[model samples]
Target: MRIYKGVIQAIQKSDEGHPFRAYLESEVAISEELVQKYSNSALGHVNSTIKELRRLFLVDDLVDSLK
Candidate 1:
């Protein structure tokens, strides 16, 4: 299976048009607050995958549907 399938789907399906693409194409700035949950990954890549998903996947529709 794909590692981050849900995250991939969110970006592919839900995030359609302009601003979403703009944000991604705009800048590469990143911080721990990016994620809605569990800030500051002091543990390195241990929980990085989960952290990325939580942060990048910031849409209520996709998140709710998954659960």
Candidate 2:
């Protein structure tokens, strides 16, 4: 399973985009078995990209107008 974290950034006055600039951080942790499988073959790059994009999967703008 993956871990998840997020923080709301204030964007209330900007017309260019939504009023919340969320900072999503990683929730991944290393386990003993997975560490041995890759053996340091550049796993971080792939993992980071996946994690980052997943954090941005939210579309909260819809909720804004609904309320």
- Against the correct fold, how does model 1 do in TM-score? 0.20
Candidate 1 achieves a global lDDT of 0.34
Q: How many residue pairs clash in each candidate?
A: 0, 0
Model 1 CA deviation exceeding 4 Å by range: 1-43, 59-67
Q: lDDT of each structure?
A: 0.34, 0.32
The sequence of per-residue lDDT tens digits that candidate 1 reaches over residues 1-56 is 23124234326655444234333311122222233221344344344445544664
Per-model TM values vs. the true structure? 0.20, 0.20
Report the lDDT tens digits of candidate 2 across residue range 1-67: 2111111221332552553322122212222223232346346536654655455455433222112
Candidate 2: C-alpha lDDT: 0.32
